[PDB]
Amino acid sequence: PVYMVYVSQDRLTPSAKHAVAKAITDAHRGLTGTQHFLAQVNFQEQPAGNVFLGGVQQGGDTIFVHGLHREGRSADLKGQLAQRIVDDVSVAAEIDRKHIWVYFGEMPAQQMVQYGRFLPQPGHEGEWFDNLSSDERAFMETNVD
Amino acid sequence: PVYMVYVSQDRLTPSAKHAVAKAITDAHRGLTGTQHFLAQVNFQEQPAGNVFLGGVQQGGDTIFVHGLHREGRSADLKGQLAQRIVDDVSVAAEIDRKHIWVYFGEMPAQQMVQYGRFLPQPGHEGEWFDNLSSDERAFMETNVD
Amino acid sequence: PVYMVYVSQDRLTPSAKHAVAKAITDAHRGLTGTQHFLAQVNFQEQPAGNVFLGGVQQGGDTIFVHGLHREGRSADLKGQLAQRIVDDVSVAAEIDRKHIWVYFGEMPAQQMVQYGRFLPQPGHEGEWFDNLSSDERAFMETNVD
């Protein structure tokens, strides 16, 4: 997956960003089985005041997670995952749940590329990973926290 | 919905940002019935020159609106909504309509979370809201212009 | 199309951004037949360290391309275009392909607006073009490198 995380500048320190990324990644792996190294968290910071709710300019305490996923998972699983991202980001960012928005979009795995390779269908990550070259496998394994 | 609005840095004053957010939110509310406070406009600013059209570097005048919506509305209504966004953002930002791109993407409401809660299906926002806890309604209600 | 290109601040010089934009635009035009001026490349820069893979903070050498397209093309074609974007961005940005992620999302052309006009279905770009006013055609024609 790629989780785009839209937050205000300086609302998350580097250690908070790290904690948030770990919480989202742990949730994704925990509920889908996808290896840690296949989950990206991409923080997009903007000055406070660039978010409007109902036309009302907001302070710096809002977070929008746009998760981009492969098609093929059940609505039940996606609901569980969205709920866990809400719960665990709330803890990691020390932010009330009312300030968290989470949207999941899905695309065919056949039009999703990670580490320069096309993704497998959900659930087939082990066979896919075993089929990768030694260097590729080693390079991915550097991305596990 | 969440409207990601990609603009150049300093192209929009705070007042023009407020105006553009109001134009989009009013258009969404007017055409869908969804309450003002359920519409987020999220400005993403980048330095002028980061936009290319046909490989040609642009100045700071281009606007791309990526609207993220729940599934369930008609193609007829979605066309009316995108046209109104083009028309009203053009006025609010004082930008010629030719500089405006607008893309709508849709997701099942079951995988969309706002204010920490999953959204209802389109058209059921009234009873959804009435059934939220009193502190959640109060928090939401403030985001109205 | 709109290709959102997420990169670290300072990783691409102005010339490298031009080269990457041209490589993506030339890949899209070459494989879909859509004219150059209908392809936007939109660079989104963030400070290095805002990207995490598997919970691990990354340096400045990662690229995520989010291509937003009309529905209607085959999986085979989308695969070739994703692969060519990987290959040609690798060259243009001087970045190993293992650092490149590319996701394609699709929407109905009927809810996609460019230059203030609704897009036609894939393959019908020629006829769509010469039916716009000459002022709209003239404005688009400049956006060709």
Tab-separated table of C-alpha atoms in Angstrom:
chain	number	residue	atom	x	y	z
A	1	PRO	CA	0.000	0.000	0.000
A	2	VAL	CA	0.868	3.757	-0.122
A	3	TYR	CA	-0.602	5.766	2.735
A	4	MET	CA	-0.530	9.462	1.916
A	5	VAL	CA	-0.697	11.307	5.257
A	6	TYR	CA	-1.663	14.979	4.986
A	7	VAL	CA	-0.743	16.928	8.129
A	8	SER	CA	0.166	20.488	8.996
A	9	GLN	CA	3.794	21.613	9.124
A	10	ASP	CA	5.444	20.863	12.493
A	11	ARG	CA	2.396	19.148	13.954
A	12	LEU	CA	4.406	15.904	13.939
A	13	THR	CA	8.030	15.950	15.124
A	14	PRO	CA	10.340	13.443	13.387
A	15	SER	CA	9.767	10.995	16.244
A	16	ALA	CA	5.992	11.464	15.968
A	17	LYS	CA	6.117	10.892	12.182
A	18	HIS	CA	8.155	7.758	12.858
A	19	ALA	CA	5.621	6.547	15.438
A	20	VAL	CA	2.702	7.282	13.094
A	21	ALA	CA	4.389	5.497	10.191
A	22	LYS	CA	5.142	2.500	12.395
A	23	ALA	CA	1.552	2.406	13.666
A	24	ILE	CA	0.066	2.488	10.171
A	25	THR	CA	2.561	-0.086	8.876
A	26	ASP	CA	1.992	-2.409	11.849
A	27	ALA	CA	-1.747	-2.151	11.349
A	28	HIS	CA	-1.473	-2.981	7.651
A	29	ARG	CA	0.779	-5.929	8.193
A	30	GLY	CA	-1.173	-7.155	11.188
A	31	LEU	CA	-4.488	-7.267	9.355
A	32	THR	CA	-3.413	-8.163	5.802
A	33	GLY	CA	-0.219	-10.197	6.223
A	34	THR	CA	1.584	-7.966	3.725
A	35	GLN	CA	5.242	-7.643	4.731
A	36	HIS	CA	6.322	-4.447	6.497
A	37	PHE	CA	8.590	-3.491	3.617
A	38	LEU	CA	5.687	-3.330	1.141
A	39	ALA	CA	3.893	-0.557	3.089
A	40	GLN	CA	4.833	3.061	2.372
A	41	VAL	CA	3.793	5.980	4.585
A	42	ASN	CA	4.281	9.274	2.737
A	43	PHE	CA	3.862	12.442	4.824
A	44	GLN	CA	2.675	15.528	2.949
A	45	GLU	CA	3.104	18.633	5.114
A	46	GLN	CA	1.418	21.976	4.420
A	47	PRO	CA	1.180	25.176	6.471
A	48	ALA	CA	-1.547	25.324	9.073
A	49	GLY	CA	-4.568	27.067	7.606
A	50	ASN	CA	-4.614	25.131	4.325
A	51	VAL	CA	-7.390	22.790	5.572
A	52	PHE	CA	-11.028	23.910	5.495
A	53	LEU	CA	-13.949	21.966	6.992
A	54	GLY	CA	-17.325	23.287	5.927
A	55	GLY	CA	-15.504	26.376	4.667
A	56	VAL	CA	-14.018	27.060	8.121
A	57	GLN	CA	-10.232	27.407	8.183
A	58	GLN	CA	-8.607	24.871	10.509
A	59	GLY	CA	-5.621	24.929	12.812
A	60	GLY	CA	-2.872	22.381	12.666
A	61	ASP	CA	-4.583	19.473	14.430
A	62	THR	CA	-6.204	17.646	11.485
A	63	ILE	CA	-4.943	14.493	9.728
A	64	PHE	CA	-6.183	12.937	6.468
A	65	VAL	CA	-4.959	9.456	5.543
A	66	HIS	CA	-5.480	8.502	1.893
A	67	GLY	CA	-4.640	4.801	1.684
A	68	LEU	CA	-4.015	3.397	-1.787
A	69	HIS	CA	-4.503	-0.398	-1.822
A	70	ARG	CA	-4.706	-3.325	-4.202
A	71	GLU	CA	-8.286	-4.584	-5.003
A	72	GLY	CA	-9.338	-7.906	-3.587
A	73	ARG	CA	-9.972	-7.483	0.118
A	74	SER	CA	-13.327	-7.813	1.849
A	75	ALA	CA	-15.269	-4.794	3.056
A	76	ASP	CA	-15.109	-6.294	6.555
A	77	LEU	CA	-11.293	-6.385	6.522
A	78	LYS	CA	-11.018	-2.859	5.080
A	79	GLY	CA	-13.355	-1.533	7.783
A	80	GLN	CA	-11.272	-3.233	10.474
A	81	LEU	CA	-8.104	-1.762	8.968
A	82	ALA	CA	-9.516	1.764	8.677
A	83	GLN	CA	-10.702	1.564	12.282
A	84	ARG	CA	-7.303	0.370	13.455
A	85	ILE	CA	-5.547	3.204	11.609
A	86	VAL	CA	-7.869	5.681	13.354
A	87	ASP	CA	-7.249	4.117	16.769
A	88	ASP	CA	-3.507	3.676	16.384
A	89	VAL	CA	-2.764	7.024	14.725
A	90	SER	CA	-4.731	8.696	17.515
A	91	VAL	CA	-2.306	7.150	19.999
A	92	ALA	CA	0.878	7.676	17.979
A	93	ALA	CA	0.135	11.305	17.063
A	94	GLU	CA	-1.547	12.072	20.419
A	95	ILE	CA	-4.582	13.353	18.556
A	96	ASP	CA	-8.310	13.030	19.203
A	97	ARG	CA	-10.079	10.600	16.854
A	98	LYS	CA	-12.505	13.322	15.789
A	99	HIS	CA	-9.643	14.971	13.921
A	100	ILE	CA	-8.772	11.903	11.804
A	101	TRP	CA	-10.114	11.220	8.315
A	102	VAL	CA	-9.206	7.988	6.471
A	103	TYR	CA	-10.122	7.099	2.858
A	104	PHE	CA	-9.158	3.828	1.125
A	105	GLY	CA	-8.973	3.644	-2.657
A	106	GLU	CA	-8.274	0.406	-4.504
A	107	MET	CA	-6.689	-0.407	-7.873
A	108	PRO	CA	-5.934	-3.669	-9.704
A	109	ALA	CA	-2.636	-5.095	-8.488
A	110	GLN	CA	-1.707	-5.394	-12.191
A	111	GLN	CA	-1.354	-1.586	-12.415
A	112	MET	CA	0.588	-1.118	-9.166
A	113	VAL	CA	4.387	-1.157	-9.061
A	114	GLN	CA	6.560	-1.190	-5.935
A	115	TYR	CA	10.361	-1.354	-5.955
A	116	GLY	CA	10.107	-1.353	-9.760
A	117	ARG	CA	8.117	-4.574	-9.799
A	118	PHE	CA	4.400	-5.280	-10.331
A	119	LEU	CA	2.525	-6.300	-7.205
A	120	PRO	CA	0.904	-9.719	-6.729
A	121	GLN	CA	-2.713	-10.238	-5.783
A	122	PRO	CA	-3.449	-9.808	-2.047
A	123	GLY	CA	-2.508	-12.938	-0.141
A	124	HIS	CA	0.216	-14.052	-2.572
A	125	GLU	CA	3.039	-11.907	-1.174
A	126	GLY	CA	5.149	-14.840	-0.002
A	127	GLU	CA	5.381	-16.616	-3.353
A	128	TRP	CA	5.873	-13.234	-5.047
A	129	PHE	CA	8.723	-12.349	-2.699
A	130	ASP	CA	10.394	-15.749	-3.062
A	131	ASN	CA	10.360	-15.244	-6.858
A	132	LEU	CA	12.375	-12.013	-6.577
A	133	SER	CA	16.102	-11.840	-7.245
A	134	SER	CA	18.493	-12.067	-4.296
A	135	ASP	CA	19.511	-8.399	-4.518
A	136	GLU	CA	15.883	-7.260	-4.736
A	137	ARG	CA	14.899	-9.376	-1.714
A	138	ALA	CA	17.864	-8.048	0.258
A	139	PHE	CA	17.039	-4.468	-0.674
A	140	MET	CA	13.424	-4.794	0.473
A	141	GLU	CA	14.454	-6.444	3.735
A	142	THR	CA	16.346	-3.276	4.691
A	143	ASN	CA	12.911	-1.613	5.100
A	144	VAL	CA	11.607	-3.362	8.219
A	145	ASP	CA	11.156	-1.643	11.586
B	1	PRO	CA	-15.923	14.281	0.484
B	2	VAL	CA	-12.202	15.523	0.544
B	3	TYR	CA	-11.186	17.970	-2.184
B	4	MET	CA	-7.417	18.023	-2.626
B	5	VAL	CA	-6.676	21.366	-4.332
B	6	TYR	CA	-3.199	21.620	-5.918
B	7	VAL	CA	-2.049	25.207	-6.417
B	8	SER	CA	1.196	27.128	-6.621
B	9	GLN	CA	2.618	28.746	-3.574
B	10	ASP	CA	1.314	32.269	-2.945
B	11	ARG	CA	-1.030	32.090	-5.936
B	12	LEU	CA	-3.966	32.281	-3.508
B	13	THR	CA	-4.124	34.772	-0.657
B	14	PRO	CA	-5.659	33.486	2.602
B	15	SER	CA	-8.840	35.293	1.558
B	16	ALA	CA	-8.867	33.695	-1.900
B	17	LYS	CA	-8.230	30.267	-0.351
B	18	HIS	CA	-11.161	30.836	1.963
B	19	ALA	CA	-13.272	31.909	-1.074
B	20	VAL	CA	-12.263	28.866	-3.123
B	21	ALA	CA	-12.965	26.536	-0.193
B	22	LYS	CA	-16.361	28.191	0.208
B	23	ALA	CA	-17.145	27.838	-3.498
B	24	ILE	CA	-16.361	24.112	-3.490
B	25	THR	CA	-18.135	23.396	-0.199
B	26	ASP	CA	-21.266	25.336	-1.208
B	27	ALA	CA	-21.336	23.535	-4.550
B	28	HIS	CA	-21.019	20.137	-2.878
B	29	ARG	CA	-23.695	20.912	-0.275
B	30	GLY	CA	-26.056	22.452	-2.825
B	31	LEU	CA	-25.917	19.591	-5.310
B	32	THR	CA	-25.611	16.582	-2.950
B	33	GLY	CA	-27.395	17.717	0.230
B	34	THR	CA	-24.383	16.702	2.335
B	35	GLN	CA	-23.898	19.067	5.281
B	36	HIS	CA	-21.221	21.749	5.034
B	37	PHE	CA	-19.191	20.278	7.870
B	38	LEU	CA	-18.728	16.957	6.022
B	39	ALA	CA	-16.820	18.659	3.163
B	40	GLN	CA	-13.050	19.091	3.527
B	41	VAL	CA	-11.044	21.312	1.175
B	42	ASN	CA	-7.318	20.640	1.583
B	43	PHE	CA	-4.919	22.985	-0.209
B	44	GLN	CA	-1.614	21.515	-1.395
B	45	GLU	CA	0.788	24.290	-2.371
B	46	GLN	CA	4.002	23.783	-4.346
B	47	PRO	CA	6.488	26.264	-5.837
B	48	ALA	CA	5.570	27.624	-9.254
B	49	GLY	CA	7.267	25.558	-11.942
B	50	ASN	CA	6.362	22.136	-10.513
B	51	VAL	CA	3.481	21.755	-12.981
B	52	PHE	CA	4.125	20.579	-16.537
B	53	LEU	CA	1.510	20.340	-19.308
B	54	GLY	CA	2.608	18.444	-22.392
B	55	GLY	CA	6.148	18.636	-21.023
B	56	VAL	CA	6.004	22.453	-20.830
B	57	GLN	CA	6.796	24.023	-17.460
B	58	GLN	CA	3.926	26.188	-16.167
B	59	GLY	CA	3.770	29.340	-14.090
B	60	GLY	CA	1.671	29.628	-10.980
B	61	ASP	CA	-1.806	29.827	-12.514
B	62	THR	CA	-2.880	26.179	-12.769
B	63	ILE	CA	-5.372	24.540	-10.409
B	64	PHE	CA	-6.060	20.792	-10.153
B	65	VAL	CA	-8.987	19.711	-7.949
B	66	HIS	CA	-8.954	16.009	-7.000
B	67	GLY	CA	-12.328	15.340	-5.367
B	68	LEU	CA	-12.632	12.110	-3.370
B	69	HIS	CA	-16.296	11.090	-3.016
B	70	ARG	CA	-18.334	8.173	-1.874
B	71	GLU	CA	-19.869	5.896	-4.548
B	72	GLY	CA	-23.570	6.047	-5.318
B	73	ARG	CA	-24.330	9.286	-7.179
B	74	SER	CA	-25.369	9.541	-10.822
B	75	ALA	CA	-23.010	10.484	-13.650
B	76	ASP	CA	-25.480	13.308	-14.362
B	77	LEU	CA	-25.064	14.814	-10.873
B	78	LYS	CA	-21.291	14.297	-10.846
B	79	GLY	CA	-21.087	16.223	-14.111
B	80	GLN	CA	-23.191	19.064	-12.730
B	81	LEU	CA	-20.957	19.147	-9.645
B	82	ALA	CA	-17.678	19.256	-11.576
B	83	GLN	CA	-18.992	21.967	-13.903
B	84	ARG	CA	-20.114	24.082	-10.949
B	85	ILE	CA	-16.724	23.626	-9.281
B	86	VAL	CA	-15.008	24.845	-12.454
B	87	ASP	CA	-17.380	27.810	-12.754
B	88	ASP	CA	-17.331	28.883	-9.117
B	89	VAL	CA	-13.640	28.266	-8.439
B	90	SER	CA	-12.903	30.341	-11.553
B	91	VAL	CA	-14.781	33.256	-9.971
B	92	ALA	CA	-13.462	32.697	-6.447
B	93	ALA	CA	-9.806	32.382	-7.491
B	94	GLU	CA	-10.043	34.918	-10.353
B	95	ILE	CA	-8.514	32.317	-12.668
B	96	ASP	CA	-9.663	31.571	-16.198
B	97	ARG	CA	-11.527	28.256	-16.405
B	98	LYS	CA	-8.952	27.044	-18.946
B	99	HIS	CA	-6.438	26.709	-16.090
B	100	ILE	CA	-8.738	24.415	-14.081
B	101	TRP	CA	-8.638	20.617	-14.020
B	102	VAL	CA	-11.118	18.621	-11.906
B	103	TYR	CA	-11.079	14.853	-11.296
B	104	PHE	CA	-13.631	12.952	-9.177
B	105	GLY	CA	-12.677	9.581	-7.678
B	106	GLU	CA	-15.181	7.452	-5.786
B	107	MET	CA	-14.951	4.864	-3.005
B	108	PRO	CA	-17.499	2.807	-1.058
B	109	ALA	CA	-18.675	4.769	1.958
B	110	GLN	CA	-17.790	1.649	4.036
B	111	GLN	CA	-14.085	2.447	3.626
B	112	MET	CA	-14.371	6.211	4.250
B	113	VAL	CA	-13.912	7.692	7.714
B	114	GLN	CA	-14.674	11.284	8.676
B	115	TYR	CA	-14.276	12.698	12.221
B	116	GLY	CA	-13.292	9.169	13.260
B	117	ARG	CA	-16.568	7.593	12.069
B	118	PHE	CA	-17.487	5.690	8.916
B	119	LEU	CA	-19.643	7.656	6.485
B	120	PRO	CA	-23.227	6.626	5.633
B	121	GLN	CA	-24.447	6.044	2.096
B	122	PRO	CA	-25.187	9.218	0.089
B	123	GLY	CA	-28.509	10.766	1.101
B	124	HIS	CA	-28.540	9.296	4.637
B	125	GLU	CA	-26.421	11.998	6.269
B	126	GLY	CA	-29.305	13.407	8.309
B	127	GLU	CA	-30.028	10.314	10.322
B	128	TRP	CA	-26.324	9.403	10.452
B	129	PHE	CA	-25.561	12.741	12.098
B	130	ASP	CA	-28.519	12.619	14.520
B	131	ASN	CA	-27.268	9.231	15.729
B	132	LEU	CA	-23.720	10.378	16.479
B	133	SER	CA	-22.861	11.076	20.103
B	134	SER	CA	-23.635	14.558	21.386
B	135	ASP	CA	-19.980	15.565	21.700
B	136	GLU	CA	-19.339	14.447	18.114
B	137	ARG	CA	-22.286	16.441	16.740
B	138	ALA	CA	-21.108	19.496	18.699
B	139	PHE	CA	-17.579	19.227	17.334
B	140	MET	CA	-18.826	18.810	13.760
B	141	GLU	CA	-21.422	21.586	13.993
B	142	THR	CA	-18.791	24.282	14.437
B	143	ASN	CA	-17.370	23.679	10.932
B	144	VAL	CA	-20.032	25.669	9.094
B	145	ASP	CA	-19.577	28.927	7.181
C	1	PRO	CA	-4.115	12.095	-17.512
C	2	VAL	CA	-2.655	13.797	-14.137
C	3	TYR	CA	0.557	12.200	-12.896
C	4	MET	CA	1.183	13.191	-9.280
C	5	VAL	CA	4.943	12.803	-8.708
C	6	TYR	CA	6.002	12.669	-5.051
C	7	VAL	CA	9.712	13.414	-4.547
C	8	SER	CA	12.020	14.870	-1.921
C	9	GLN	CA	12.841	18.565	-1.967
C	10	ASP	CA	16.036	19.263	-3.977
C	11	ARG	CA	16.278	15.728	-5.414
C	12	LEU	CA	15.298	16.925	-8.909
C	13	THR	CA	16.825	20.124	-10.289
C	14	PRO	CA	14.632	22.206	-12.647
C	15	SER	CA	16.197	20.355	-15.584
C	16	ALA	CA	15.666	16.947	-13.963
C	17	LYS	CA	12.009	17.799	-13.355
C	18	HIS	CA	11.687	18.824	-16.996
C	19	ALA	CA	13.321	15.558	-18.066
C	20	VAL	CA	11.066	13.458	-15.810
C	21	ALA	CA	7.959	15.333	-16.955
C	22	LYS	CA	8.956	14.822	-20.592
C	23	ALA	CA	9.647	11.117	-20.045
C	24	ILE	CA	6.237	10.535	-18.441
C	25	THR	CA	4.439	12.707	-20.990
C	26	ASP	CA	6.192	11.008	-23.925
C	27	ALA	CA	5.402	7.576	-22.472
C	28	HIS	CA	1.713	8.449	-22.128
C	29	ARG	CA	1.376	10.000	-25.592
C	30	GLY	CA	3.373	7.204	-27.212
C	31	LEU	CA	1.305	4.365	-25.781
C	32	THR	CA	-2.206	5.904	-25.629
C	33	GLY	CA	-2.165	8.358	-28.546
C	34	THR	CA	-3.490	11.137	-26.359
C	35	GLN	CA	-1.874	14.502	-27.331
C	36	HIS	CA	1.008	15.887	-25.276
C	37	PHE	CA	-0.968	18.853	-23.970
C	38	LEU	CA	-3.538	16.612	-22.273
C	39	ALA	CA	-0.974	15.128	-19.854
C	40	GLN	CA	-0.218	16.976	-16.625
C	41	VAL	CA	2.807	16.074	-14.513
C	42	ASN	CA	2.434	17.635	-11.047
C	43	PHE	CA	5.523	17.491	-8.817
C	44	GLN	CA	4.796	17.320	-5.084
C	45	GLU	CA	7.945	17.973	-3.064
C	46	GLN	CA	8.390	17.305	0.645
C	47	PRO	CA	11.496	17.350	2.855
C	48	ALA	CA	13.528	14.162	2.814
C	49	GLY	CA	12.539	11.989	5.754
C	50	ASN	CA	8.799	12.260	5.161
C	51	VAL	CA	8.743	8.849	3.422
C	52	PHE	CA	8.762	5.634	5.446
C	53	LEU	CA	9.016	2.110	4.030
C	54	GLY	CA	8.171	-0.633	6.490
C	55	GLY	CA	8.451	1.955	9.251
C	56	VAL	CA	11.989	2.942	8.181
C	57	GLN	CA	12.636	6.582	7.364
C	58	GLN	CA	13.947	7.034	3.820
C	59	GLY	CA	16.469	9.451	2.366
C	60	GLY	CA	15.828	11.649	-0.646
C	61	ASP	CA	16.064	8.934	-3.305
C	62	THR	CA	12.479	7.627	-3.594
C	63	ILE	CA	9.796	8.458	-6.148
C	64	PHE	CA	6.087	7.644	-6.105
C	65	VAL	CA	4.082	8.269	-9.282
C	66	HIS	CA	0.302	8.322	-8.867
C	67	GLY	CA	-1.168	8.300	-12.370
C	68	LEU	CA	-4.805	9.347	-12.617
C	69	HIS	CA	-6.379	8.132	-15.893
C	70	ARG	CA	-9.647	7.701	-17.741
C	71	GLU	CA	-11.223	4.257	-17.646
C	72	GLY	CA	-11.225	2.282	-20.868
C	73	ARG	CA	-7.717	0.988	-21.548
C	74	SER	CA	-6.667	-2.634	-21.320
C	75	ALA	CA	-4.665	-4.147	-18.487
C	76	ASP	CA	-2.005	-5.020	-21.056
C	77	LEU	CA	-1.641	-1.395	-22.148
C	78	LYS	CA	-1.648	-0.086	-18.569
C	79	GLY	CA	1.099	-2.573	-17.713
C	80	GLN	CA	3.272	-1.469	-20.625
C	81	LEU	CA	2.765	2.187	-19.706
C	82	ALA	CA	3.584	1.573	-16.038
C	83	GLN	CA	6.725	-0.329	-17.041
C	84	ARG	CA	7.793	2.397	-19.467
C	85	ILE	CA	7.249	5.044	-16.800
C	86	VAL	CA	9.500	3.047	-14.461
C	87	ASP	CA	12.183	2.602	-17.149
C	88	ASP	CA	12.137	6.176	-18.447
C	89	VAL	CA	11.904	7.922	-15.069
C	90	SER	CA	14.808	5.753	-13.900
C	91	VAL	CA	16.889	7.212	-16.749
C	92	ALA	CA	15.533	10.768	-16.515
C	93	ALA	CA	15.916	11.078	-12.735
C	94	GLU	CA	19.118	8.960	-12.604
C	95	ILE	CA	17.533	6.744	-9.959
C	96	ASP	CA	17.614	2.963	-9.565
C	97	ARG	CA	14.312	1.289	-10.483
C	98	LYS	CA	14.132	-0.277	-7.015
C	99	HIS	CA	13.371	3.240	-5.733
C	100	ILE	CA	10.377	3.729	-8.070
C	101	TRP	CA	6.734	3.067	-7.173
C	102	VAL	CA	3.901	3.659	-9.670
C	103	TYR	CA	0.135	3.346	-9.131
C	104	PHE	CA	-2.538	3.903	-11.780
C	105	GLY	CA	-6.074	4.847	-10.768
C	106	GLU	CA	-8.906	5.224	-13.291
C	107	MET	CA	-12.127	7.236	-13.377
C	108	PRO	CA	-14.899	7.644	-15.967
C	109	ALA	CA	-13.943	10.357	-18.459
C	110	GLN	CA	-17.384	11.868	-17.773
C	111	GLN	CA	-16.205	12.970	-14.311
C	112	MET	CA	-12.808	14.283	-15.505
C	113	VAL	CA	-12.303	17.921	-16.522
C	114	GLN	CA	-9.205	19.399	-18.172
C	115	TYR	CA	-8.835	23.007	-19.326
C	116	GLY	CA	-12.360	23.512	-18.024
C	117	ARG	CA	-13.782	20.885	-20.418
C	118	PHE	CA	-14.962	17.326	-19.860
C	119	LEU	CA	-12.655	14.704	-21.342
C	120	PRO	CA	-13.864	12.353	-24.097
C	121	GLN	CA	-13.566	8.572	-24.020
C	122	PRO	CA	-10.078	7.173	-24.756
C	123	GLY	CA	-9.263	7.109	-28.455
C	124	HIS	CA	-11.635	9.982	-29.332
C	125	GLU	CA	-9.183	12.797	-28.569
C	126	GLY	CA	-8.747	13.969	-32.163
C	127	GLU	CA	-12.441	14.638	-32.773
C	128	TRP	CA	-12.881	16.079	-29.323
C	129	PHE	CA	-10.007	18.493	-29.943
C	130	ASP	CA	-11.346	20.044	-33.171
C	131	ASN	CA	-14.792	20.829	-31.776
C	132	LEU	CA	-13.493	23.007	-29.021
C	133	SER	CA	-13.414	26.667	-29.934
C	134	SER	CA	-10.305	27.985	-31.627
C	135	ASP	CA	-9.497	29.896	-28.431
C	136	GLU	CA	-9.461	26.646	-26.449
C	137	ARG	CA	-7.438	24.884	-29.147
C	138	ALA	CA	-4.936	27.760	-29.224
C	139	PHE	CA	-4.505	27.701	-25.462
C	140	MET	CA	-3.884	23.937	-25.461
C	141	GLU	CA	-1.492	23.991	-28.433
C	142	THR	CA	1.130	26.029	-26.575
C	143	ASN	CA	1.493	23.209	-24.015
C	144	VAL	CA	3.526	21.028	-26.380
C	145	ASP	CA	7.258	20.546	-25.818
